[PDB]
Amino acid sequence: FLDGIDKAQEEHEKYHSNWRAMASDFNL
Amino acid sequence: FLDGIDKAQEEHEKYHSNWRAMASDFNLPPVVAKEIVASCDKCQLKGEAMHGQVDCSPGIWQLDCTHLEGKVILVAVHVASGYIEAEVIPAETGQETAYFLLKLAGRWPVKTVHTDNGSNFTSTTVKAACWWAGIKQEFGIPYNPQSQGVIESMNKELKKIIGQVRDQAEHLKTAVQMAVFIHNFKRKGGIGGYSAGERIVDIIATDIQTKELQKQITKIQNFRVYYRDSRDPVWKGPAKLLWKGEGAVVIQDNSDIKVVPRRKAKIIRD
Amino acid sequence: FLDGIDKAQEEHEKYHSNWRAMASDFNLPPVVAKEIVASCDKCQLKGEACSPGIWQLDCTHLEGKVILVAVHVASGYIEAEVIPAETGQETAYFLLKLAGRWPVKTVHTDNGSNFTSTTVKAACWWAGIKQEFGIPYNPQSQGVIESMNKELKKIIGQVRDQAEHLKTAVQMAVFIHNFKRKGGIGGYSAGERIVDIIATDIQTKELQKQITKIQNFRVYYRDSRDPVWKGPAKLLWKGEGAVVIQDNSDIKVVPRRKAKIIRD
Amino acid sequence: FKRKGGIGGYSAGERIVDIIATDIQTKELQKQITKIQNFRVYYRDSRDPVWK
DNA sequence: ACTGCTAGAGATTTTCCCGCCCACG
DNA sequence: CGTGGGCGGGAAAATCTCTAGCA
DNA sequence: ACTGCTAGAGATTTTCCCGCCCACG
DNA sequence: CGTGGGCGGGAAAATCTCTAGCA
Ligand SMILES: C[C@@H]1CCO[C@H]2Cn3cc(C(=O)NCc4ccc(F)cc4F)c(=O)c(O)c3C(=O)N12
Ligand SMILES: C[C@@H]1CCO[C@H]2Cn3cc(C(=O)NCc4ccc(F)cc4F)c(=O)c(O)c3C(=O)N12
Ligand SMILES: [Mg+2]
Ligand SMILES: [Mg+2]
């Protein structure tokens, strides 16, 4: 794959986000 | 007095023995053994074992200075939500911390500060600024950094994310701003999966909703509760009804928040 | 509960109130209120283009010293910062500070030389902020920005004897404009409006993030006195005894034993 | 405005204001405040830092 | 292929004893 | 007039926990 | 009059789902 | 030949616990 997963990967590249933040913000 | 008890005392004078040793060697009750243990002024133990409670009120903010790469960093943290804020200080002095506190008071509803007993946090400029802004000052135990440890844990977290974020930026403080942005917004979890930036909204939203609803309801609902207390027949009152229960109401007579049963109660309209 | 939906529908036909009024008044789940406000014809206004990220930027030069002023224009909140030297790095630093405190989504400014640096472009690329140059979002508050700057200069003319340095009096002035200026509909100084706007935006974007995964899902359902598995209807509220769905245009309730939820 | 009598000594336009004020107080506002002040409170007790 | 551990203090639960008194022989 | 049993009040014993110190 | 506290990792318990197959309409 | 319900196997979610570090 989804585009939200790829944008969560960009979020991980910029901020090293939590797993729950990426799961909540993109329904993962 | 038995002679073995006096010789137990002399044994404690020579060796500072256990209470169980004097109990077993002379067939003694443990009360007199712990008395003889308490008798010696050198037989003093390691203290008591329980932790205190740090206050959790929305008007309190913790503040502390820390050190990294030869620079001083001023951190302030709201206690209930964990919303953080940090800056690099030019020099450790009370006037720049007073300027930081004035920025904090201008941006947030701050009522009471609580720091340690450092030199910069005891300046006359900080006292004059807190008198100008009407901020109650408070300090902790002079040699106990544990009451203020909640901001130290966040300093640890801040430097840990600073370790993750130092390579992206040239200067230190740019990465510091990026890190405080990351922790205030990007880091989720805690109580209900939110960042601290949402809880600091929700706490003040409940603050400027619930007590205003309470002020609107306290002028309308005014019930006078007379109560027959336990072990007695005296109908005492009147008390202010806080909330009507199903089998037990809650009231306040003068200062006692009491859960008095409704069968032992009597509610008057005015 | 379920019989108030039609009297919310005729209410939205006569008066066209939003989902919050029909949700809080009729004690409904807000998803059926958002679908009632969604199914209307003349209640379909514009999109986002409201915004909590309405932020005006304006520079001034007072006492030969630069003051950069930001305004949260959705709530009328305003603050500023004393800047020593006019460069894009200072504006990017202040913009990253504003992004760290509040969720800055869009900024409105002019085409000034200090605000057009590539450092600010890299900062807003790392932040993800829509940017406007010279374009007002709406021309009502356009003069009000300048009038608030003049109001803050009047507050500076009040409190210049309250502090020695420029920025200390500036912080006292923004404290006064945050708290010592009352009025309005319910006596809000400056912060209660912006925390109300931010709380409502957070709640409605949580509702958007909740509902954006439900519309992918399918509910195949049969009825009571029926074995014909109809669908796939759209889920509104998953319940323990009754599940709310919509098949074509009707808000229906179903037993969970008659339900079948596709996970994608 | 200027013909005052009755119980409380008001005129007509003031008595109707006080009467409909008491009416809108006792009509729905008490029930509205008592049905909105139910909330969610997290807390901890003494000698234990685990919030409940 | 190696590894955190141990003495003491309230605190709290679990359990005999005694006296006693109310219920019975 | 001569016993029994539970209770309750108190002592006292086993365990929970928990803490600070070893640099 | 003051007060230890907080983010993360296995681990363990609690709980939907699905498919299926054995028991039944 | 046409359905229902428990089971089991697996996912997955809420909580227990426990530690590292703040000089
Ligand atoms: C010169 C050798 C060479 C190898 O390294 C050093 C350093 N060291 C450090 C501690 C120490 O930190 N004790 C306090 C402590 C803290 C935590 C914990 F879990 C256990 C603890 F004992 C010692 O006791 C010790 O003997 C030594 C030592 O001998 N040496
Ligand atoms: C110069 C002021 C004057 C007063 O005394 C000093 C010394 N100090 C020491 C620590 C420290 O050891 N933190 C680690 C830690 C260890 C155990 C625990 F339970 C809690 C903890 F935070 C600080 O954090 C700190 O800020 C200070 C400080 O500021 N000062
Ligand atoms: Mg300190
Ligand atoms: Mg410290």
PDB file of C-alpha atoms (C1' of nucleotides) in Angstrom, chain G residues 1-22:
ATOM      1  C1'  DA G   1       5.569  22.592  55.568  1.00  0.00           C
ATOM      2  C1'  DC G   2       6.941  16.978  51.754  1.00  0.00           C
ATOM      3  C1'  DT G   3       6.911  12.528  48.534  1.00  0.00           C
ATOM      4  C1'  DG G   4      10.423   8.213  42.207  1.00  0.00           C
ATOM      5  C1'  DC G   5       9.323   8.010  37.708  1.00  0.00           C
ATOM      6  C1'  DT G   6       8.609   6.512  32.679  1.00  0.00           C
ATOM      7  C1'  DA G   7       9.197   4.098  27.747  1.00  0.00           C
ATOM      8  C1'  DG G   8       9.843  -0.706  25.718  1.00  0.00           C
ATOM      9  C1'  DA G   9       9.946  -6.578  25.399  1.00  0.00           C
ATOM     10  C1'  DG G  10       8.689 -10.870  25.957  1.00  0.00           C
ATOM     11  C1'  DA G  11       5.305 -13.580  28.251  1.00  0.00           C
ATOM     12  C1'  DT G  12       0.918 -14.867  29.522  1.00  0.00           C
ATOM     13  C1'  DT G  13      -3.807 -14.674  29.585  1.00  0.00           C
ATOM     14  C1'  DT G  14      -8.098 -13.529  27.116  1.00  0.00           C
ATOM     15  C1'  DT G  15     -10.697 -13.557  23.025  1.00  0.00           C
ATOM     16  C1'  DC G  16     -12.753 -13.439  17.919  1.00  0.00           C
ATOM     17  C1'  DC G  17     -12.766 -16.296  13.443  1.00  0.00           C
ATOM     18  C1'  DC G  18     -13.138 -19.818  10.366  1.00  0.00           C
ATOM     19  C1'  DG G  19     -13.677 -23.990   8.600  1.00  0.00           C
ATOM     20  C1'  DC G  20     -15.030 -27.996   9.260  1.00  0.00           C
ATOM     21  C1'  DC G  21     -16.629 -31.791  10.374  1.00  0.00           C
ATOM     22  C1'  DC G  22     -19.440 -34.304  12.895  1.00  0.00           C
TER      23       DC G  22
END
